[PDB]
């Protein structure tokens, strides 16, 4: 039968006051003849009913997509708090109860740095640029780039992984194509760096420059 899960907030929005993360509860695969549904948001089993629900969207599955946004002040998520999206329908006789929340352990201050590409990896075409992080905890983290104060968008990255150190580690790729704005600065060796955000970070932020 059908089944549905929710979506957590974005670390880029968390740990940043002005930003507004969003605990989101998506719903899909409505019944061709029994699609009705309504939400109820609980806090450890405490209803608030203060969410903003959105319309529907059809899909190639001949069904509709439903979702509602939930407001955040970050505190209760910063110190720890569980949420619960209660939904329903007729195709399924049971309600929903999911114990999604922040986790806790031994927080690790991100061990951070920058590194160039390899002489041999120069080739011709889309060169790579990277920036790595390890010794951090937990896995909820996302980072971005900055360039002389200006941003970059053509980047990508990877999820974290565990090892014997009891922490996490990963890198972020940055595509840098030929005859483009991504490399003009690099060849000219200006301020490149990695904008990182994480809980264990002192002031919840650090940074590392990069150039030739």
């Amino acid at each position: 039968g059908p089944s549905v899960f929710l979506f957590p907030p974005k670390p880029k929005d968390t740990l940043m006051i002005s930003r507004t993360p969003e605990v989101t509860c998506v719903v899909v695969d409505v019944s061709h003849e029994d699609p009705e549904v309504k939400f109820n948001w609980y806090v450890d089993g405490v209803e608030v009913h203060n969410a903003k629900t959105k319309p529907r969207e059809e899909q190639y599955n001949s069904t509709y997509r439903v979702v509602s946004v939930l407001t955040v002040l970050h505190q209760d998520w910063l110190n720890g708090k569980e949420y619960k999206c209660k939904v329903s329908n007729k195709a399924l006789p049971a309600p929903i109860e999911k114990t999604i929340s922040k986790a806790k352990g031994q927080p690790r201050e991100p061990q951070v740095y920058t590194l160039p590409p390899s002489r041999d990896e120069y080739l011709y075409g889309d060169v790579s640029l990277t920036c790595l992080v390890k010794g951090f905890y937990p896995s909820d983290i996302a980072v971005e780039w900055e360039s002389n104060g200006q941003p970059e968008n053509n980047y990508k990255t990877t999820p974290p992984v565990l090892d014997s150190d009891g922490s996490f580690f990963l890198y972020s790729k940055l595509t840098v194509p030929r005859h483009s704005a991504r490399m003009w600065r690099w060849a000219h060796g200006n301020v490149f760096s990695c904008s990182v955000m994480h809980e264990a970070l002192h002031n919840h932020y650090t940074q590392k420059s990069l150039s030739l």
């Binding site: 002489r119 120069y122 080739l123 011709y124 075409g125 060169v127 030929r178 490399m183 060849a187 000219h188 060796g189 030739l212």
Partner: protein
């Protein structure tokens, strides 16, 4: 820092005496004493001389002449040493301080001297001739200011006088009036002293003063002294500063003496100030003497691992001491001289037959080589056919010890150039700046002279040159990318701290990497030329390092071919 330096004017005629007026507020304001000659000339009644309120000592000849003021605020001065002497003879002189030409109520000169604070003199005499309109001369018996030495160091005084005098104040012993006021009475320290005693506040041996001491004393003890002979050692009158080192009992075995002090300007101190020299001899000075050359460690003067190193000397040196200026001769004597040890200057006497030979424009550009000088500069004329002075495309610093008229790090006036391009300057030693009489000149106030200074006393007097308000005509302005407008002239070459990158000497946006045929790479906000062997590329940057290695586009294993 807390003092000023002597000068070399000798009945000299400066230009635009409004600059001569400002020539010294930056010198003597906040100055206690002088290191050399003090020279006062050409000053009318209009005078803002409060900065001279606090003066105490001299090292060279004092001088006044052709000065038409009615008052001088010179007080608290009690020493003159006379290391240098007018006509190599006198410690202080006065001449023709009046007006022989033309409502306003005034005499046209000076009436009285008023120098009660003066009490001590060393080697040197005094002259005062042809000084009408002043009284209270021949009034105080100069001898009682002289030492037991220089008793035969004669003097000479004016008698031809215009206006009548007044009897000395009744509150003064005899007729010792520097001025009609009791505030200008006199005390002396020669005759009343205790027999052989040199100085005293009274005939009592308790009032007698220390030998090395001078000017009297509140007590013959050192701290109680008034005029320390050779230095004020942290408030003490001793004869010689403590030696830097000491040799052991009976062995050629030296070892430092922390209490040692360098000798300089009557001040036993730890180190030598900026612009000055350090010597194992033990004296901060302005010349690195015989068989002794200079290095750094910030400067110091000691012998090297070879006889006197052969280098280029400038004017005022051991064989250019009595030179006027540059001529057809001794011009290629600067051939590729990385660093001169002297000074130089230009006059019309160079650009004239001088029947000898004159100079020429094209026999130049040797100054694309110079990286440092020791002395000063001075200019008077220049041909019209030469727009600029780019020939100095690169000079690091002047570091001028010796100065023109003993006051200027450089001088320039009477020319017709449009602009200037001394771009590689970040620092300047002693000496004061000066400029005027440059008609076509522009891009003058595009300079942060204060940055180049290294001594707070320095400044710049400028006038008689086309201003920015009119130079902008036709669209004059500092270069685009030059930061904060710190240009010397047009073109990026004349930049200083241009955030954009440069080629050898051209700041521009494009360190053309891969879009200019002779490829390039980057380092220190500066463009560099890619290796030769590394073939041209077109995907991304063609090179990765200056040398043959660290390359990509190959045309031995790590090289290209």
């Amino acid at each position: 820092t807390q003092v000023c330096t002597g000068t070399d004017m000798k009945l000299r005629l400066p230009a635009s005496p409004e600059t001569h007026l400002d020539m010294l507020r930056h010198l003597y304001q906040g100055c206690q004493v002088v290191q050399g000659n003090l020279e006062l000339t050409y000053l009318p009644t209009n005078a803002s001389l409060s900065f001279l309120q606090d003066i105490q000592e001299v090292q060279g000849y004092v001088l006044i002449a052709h000065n038409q003021v009615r008052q001088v605020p010179l007080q608290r001065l009690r020493i003159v040493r006379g290391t240098q002497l007018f006509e190599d003879n006198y410690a202080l002189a006065v001449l023709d301080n009046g007006d022989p030409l033309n409502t306003g109520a005034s005499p046209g000169g000076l009436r009285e001297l008023q120098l009660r604070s003066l009490t001590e003199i060393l080697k040197g005499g005094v002259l005062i001739q042809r000084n009408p309109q002043l009284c209270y001369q021949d009034t105080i018996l100069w001898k009682d200011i002289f030492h037991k030495n220089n008793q035969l160091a004669l003097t000479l005084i004016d008698t031809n006088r215009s206006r009548a005098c007044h009897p000395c104040s009744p509150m003064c012993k005899g007729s010792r009036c520097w001025g009609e006021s009791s505030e200008d009475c006199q005390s002396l320290t020669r005759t009343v002293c205790a027999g052989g005693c040199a100085r005293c506040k009274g005939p009592l041996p308790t009032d007698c003063c220390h030998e090395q001491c001078a000017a009297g004393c509140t007590g013959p003890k050192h701290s109680d002294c008034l005029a320390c002979l050779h230095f004020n050692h942290s408030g003490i009158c001793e004869l010689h500063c403590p030696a830097l080192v000491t040799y052991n009992t009976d062995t050629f075995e030296s070892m430092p003496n922390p209490e040692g002090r360098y000798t300089f300007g009557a001040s036993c101190v730890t180190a030598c100030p900026y612009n000055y020299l350090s010597t194992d001899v033990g004296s901060c000075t302005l010349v690195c003497p015989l068989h002794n050359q200079e290095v750094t460690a910030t400067q110091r003067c000691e012998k090297c691992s070879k006889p006197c190193a052969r280098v280029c000397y400038g004017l005022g040196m051991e064989h250019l001491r009595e030179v006027r200026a540059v001529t057809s001769a001794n011009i290629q004597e600067f051939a590729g001289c990385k660093k001169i040890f002297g000074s130089l200057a230009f006059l019309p006497e160079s650009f004239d037959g001088d029947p000898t030979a004159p100079l020429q424009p094209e026999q130049l550009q040797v100054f694309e080589t110079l990286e440092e000088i020791t002395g000063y500069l001075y200019i008077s004329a220049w041909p019209d056919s030469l727009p600029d002075l780019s020939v100095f495309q690169n000079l690091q610093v002047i570091r001028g010890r010796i100065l023109h008229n003993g006051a200027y790090s450089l001088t320039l006036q009477g020319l017709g150039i449009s602009w200037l391009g001394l771009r590689s300057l970040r620092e300047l030693g002693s000496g004061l700046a000066l400029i005027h009489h440059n008609t076509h000149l522009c891009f003058v106030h595009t300079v942060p002279w204060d940055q180049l200074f290294r001594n707070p006393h320095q400044a710049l007097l400028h006038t008689a040159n086309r201003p920015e308000d009119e130079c902008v005509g036709e669209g004059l302005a500092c270069h685009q990318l030059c930061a904060r407008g710190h240009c010397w002239g047009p073109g990026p070459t004349q930049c200083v701290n241009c955030s954009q990158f440069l080629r050898g000497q051209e700041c521009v946006e494009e360190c053309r990497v891969l879009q200019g045929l002779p490829r390039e790479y980057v380092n220190a906000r500066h463009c560099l030329p890619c290796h030769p062997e590394c073939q041209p590329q077109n995907g991304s940057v063609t090179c990765f390092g200056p040398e043959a290695d660290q390359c990509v586009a190959c045309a031995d294993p790590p090289f290209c071919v």
